[PDB]
Amino acid sequence: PIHLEIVTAERVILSDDVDMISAPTKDGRVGILPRHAPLMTILEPGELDIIKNGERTPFAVSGGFMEVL
Amino acid sequence: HVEVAAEVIFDGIPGFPITNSFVVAIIIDIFVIALAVAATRNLQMVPRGLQNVMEFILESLYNLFRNINAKYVATAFPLVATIFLFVLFGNWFGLLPGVGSIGVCGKKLVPLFRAPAADLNFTFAIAVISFVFIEYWGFRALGPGYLKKFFNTNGIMSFVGIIEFISELVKPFALAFRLFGNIFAGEVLLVVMAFLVPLLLPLPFYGFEVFVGFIQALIFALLTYAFLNIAVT
Amino acid sequence: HVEVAAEVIFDGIPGFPITNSFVVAIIIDIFVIALAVAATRNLQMVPRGLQNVMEFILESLYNLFRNINAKYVATAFPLVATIFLFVLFGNWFGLLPGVGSIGVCGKKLVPLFRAPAADLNFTFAIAVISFVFIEYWGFRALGPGYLKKFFNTNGIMSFVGIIEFISELVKPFALAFRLFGNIFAGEVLLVVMAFLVPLLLPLPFYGFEVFVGFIQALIFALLTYAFLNIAVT
Amino acid sequence: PTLFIAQLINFLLLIFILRALLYRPVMNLLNERTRRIEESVRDAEKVR
Amino acid sequence: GINPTLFIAQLINFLLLIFILRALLYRPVMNLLNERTRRIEESVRDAEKVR
Amino acid sequence: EGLNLVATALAVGLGAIGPGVGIGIIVSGAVQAIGRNPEIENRVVTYMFIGIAFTEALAIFGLVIAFLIGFG
Amino acid sequence: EGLNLVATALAVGLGAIGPGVGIGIIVSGAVQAIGRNPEIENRVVTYMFIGIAFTEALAIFGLVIAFLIGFG
Amino acid sequence: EGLNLVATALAVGLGAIGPGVGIGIIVSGAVQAIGRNPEIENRVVTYMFIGIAFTEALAIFGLVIAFLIGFG
Amino acid sequence: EGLNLVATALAVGLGAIGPGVGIGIIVSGAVQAIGRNPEIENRVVTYMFIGIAFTEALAIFGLVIAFLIGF
Amino acid sequence: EGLNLVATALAVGLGAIGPGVGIGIIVSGAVQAIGRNPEIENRVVTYMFIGIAFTEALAIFGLVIAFLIGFG
Amino acid sequence: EGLNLVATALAVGLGAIGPGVGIGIIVSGAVQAIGRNPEIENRVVTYMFIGIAFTEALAIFGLVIAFLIGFG
Amino acid sequence: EGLNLVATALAVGLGAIGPGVGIGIIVSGAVQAIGRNPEIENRVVTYMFIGIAFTEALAIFGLVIAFLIGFG
Amino acid sequence: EGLNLVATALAVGLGAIGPGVGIGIIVSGAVQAIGRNPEIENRVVTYMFIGIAFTEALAIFGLVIAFLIGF
Amino acid sequence: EGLNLVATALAVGLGAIGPGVGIGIIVSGAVQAIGRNPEIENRVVTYMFIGIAFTEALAIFGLVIAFLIGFG
Amino acid sequence: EGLNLVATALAVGLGAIGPGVGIGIIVSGAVQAIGRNPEIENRVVTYMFIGIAFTEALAIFGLVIAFLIGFG
Amino acid sequence: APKLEAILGVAISAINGFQSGKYDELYIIYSEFINTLVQRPAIKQLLPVESPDISTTTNVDYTYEPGEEEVLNSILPRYVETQIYQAVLESIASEHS
| Partners of A25 in beta bridges | A43
Letter string b/e over residues M29-52, b meaning 16 or more CB atoms within 10 A of that residue's CB: bbbbbbbbbeebbebbbebbeebb
Strands A30-32, A39-42: pairing is: unpaired
SS3 for C101?
Answer: coil
Measured between beta carbons, which residues in chain J are less than 8 angstroms from residue L70? 68
| Cα–Cα distance, N5 to B62 (Å, whole number) | 65
Largest CA distance in chain B: 66
Beta-carbon-side half-sphere exposure of residue E14 (alpha carbons within 13 Å): 28
**Cβ count within 10 A of residue C93:** 20
| Cα–Cα distance, P26 to F11 (Å, whole number) | 69
Residue J9: name the closest of C180, I5, E44 by CA: I5
CA angle F6, F10, F15 (to 5 degrees): 160
Which residues are CB-neighbours of J8 under 8 A, at least 6 positions away?
I7, I11, I65, I68, I69, J66, J69, J70, L9
Which residues are CB-neighbours of N43 under 8 A, at least 6 positions away?
none
- Chain J adjacent subunits, 3+ CB pairs under 8 A: A, C, I, L
Residue to substitute from C82, C123, C180, interface E, most E β-carbons within 10 A: C82
| Cα–Cα distance, C130 to C225 (Å, whole number) | 10
In contact, F17 and K19? CB cutoff 8 Å? no
Quick check: do D and B touch, 3+ CB pairs under 8 A? no
One-letter amino acid of F27? V
* Chain C to chain N Cβ contacts (< 8 Å): 15
**Cβ count within 10 A of residue B194:** 16
DSSP-derived letter for residue A52 is: E
Give the dihedral sign, CA K49/K51/K55/K60. positive
Decide if C188 touches J, using CB distance below 8 A. yes
Q: What is the DSSP string of B62-80?
A: HHHHHHH-SSSHHHHHHHH
Residue H72 to chain G, least CA–CA distance (Å): 15
DSSP-derived letter for residue A36 is: P
The radius of gyration of chain M from alpha carbons, rounded to an integer in Å, stands at: 17
Measured between beta carbons, which residues in chain I are less than 8 angstroms from residue J19? 18, 58
Number of H helices, E strands in chain C: 6, 0
In this complex, do C223 and J46 lie within 8 Å of one another by their Cβ atoms?
A: no
| Cα–Cα distance, L21 to L27 (Å, whole number) | 11
Letter string b/e over residues I43-62, b meaning 16 or more CB atoms within 10 A of that residue's CB: bbeebbebbbbbbbbbbbbb
| Partners of A52 in beta bridges | A55
Strands A6-7, A2-3: pairing is: unpaired
In contact, D11 and C97? CB cutoff 8 Å? yes
| Cα–Cα distance, L27 to J53 (Å, whole number) | 12
Torsions phi, psi for C104 (to 5 deg):
-65, -35
One-letter amino acid of B145? G
Residue to substitute from I52, I64, I68, I71, interface C, most C β-carbons within 10 A: I64
- Chain C adjacent subunits, 3+ CB pairs under 8 A: D, E, I, J, L, N
| Cα–Cα distance, N46 to N30 (Å, whole number) | 10
The radius of gyration of chain D from alpha carbons, rounded to an integer in Å, stands at: 20
- Chain E adjacent subunits, 3+ CB pairs under 8 A: C, D
Ramachandran category for residue F40: left, alpha or beta (phi over 0 → left; psi -120 to 50 → alpha):
alpha
In contact, B112 and B106? CB cutoff 8 Å? no
Q: How many residues can be counted in chain L?
A: 72
SS3 for A61?
Answer: strand
| Cα–Cα distance, J61 to L17 (Å, whole number) | 11
Reduced to 3 DSSP states, what percent helix, strand and coil does chain L have, rounded to the nearest 5? 95, 0, 5
Strands A30-32, A49-52: pairing is: unpaired
| Cα–Cα distance, E27 to E8 (Å, whole number) | 29
Q: What is the DSSP string of I55-70?
A: HHHHHHHHHHHHHHHH
Strands P27-33, A55-58: pairing is: unpaired
Residue J28: name the closest of H57, C185, N28, G23 by CA: N28
SS3 for P31?
Answer: strand
Which residues are CB-neighbours of C156 under 8 A, at least 6 positions away?
N45, N46, N49, N50, N53
| Cα–Cα distance, P28 to B83 (Å, whole number) | 66
| Cα–Cα distance, I52 to I38 (Å, whole number) | 20
In contact, B138 and F24? CB cutoff 8 Å? no
Q: C-alpha dihedral over L23, L24, L25, L30, to 10 degrees?
A: 90
| Cα–Cα distance, F59 to C64 (Å, whole number) | 52
SS3 for A39?
Answer: strand
| Burial (0-12, 13-18, 19+ Cβ within 10 Å), C182 | buried
Torsions phi, psi for P80 (to 5 deg):
-65, -35
| Partners of A41 in beta bridges | A66
User: How far is the CA of N54 from the CAs of A30, C160, M16, N30, in angstroms?
Assistant: 41, 11, 17, 16
Helices F41-70 and B203-232 cross at an angle (nearest 10°) of 110
CA angle L18, L23, L26 (to 5 degrees): 130
Q: How far is CA C28 from the centre of its chain?
A: 12
In this complex, do C97 and D34 lie within 8 Å of one another by their Cβ atoms?
A: no
| Burial (0-12, 13-18, 19+ Cβ within 10 Å), E40 | exposed
Quick check: do F and B touch, 3+ CB pairs under 8 A? yes
Long-range CB contacts for residues B196-204, cutoff 8 Å, separation at least 24: B196/K67
In contact, H62 and I61? CB cutoff 8 Å? no
In contact, J15 and L17? CB cutoff 8 Å? yes
DSSP-derived letter for residue F40 is: T
Quick check: do P and J touch, 3+ CB pairs under 8 A? no
Q: What is the DSSP string of B137-187?
A: HHHHHHTT--SSSSS--SSS-TTTTHHHHHHHTHHHHHHHHHHHHHHHHHH
In contact, C63 and E32? CB cutoff 8 Å? no
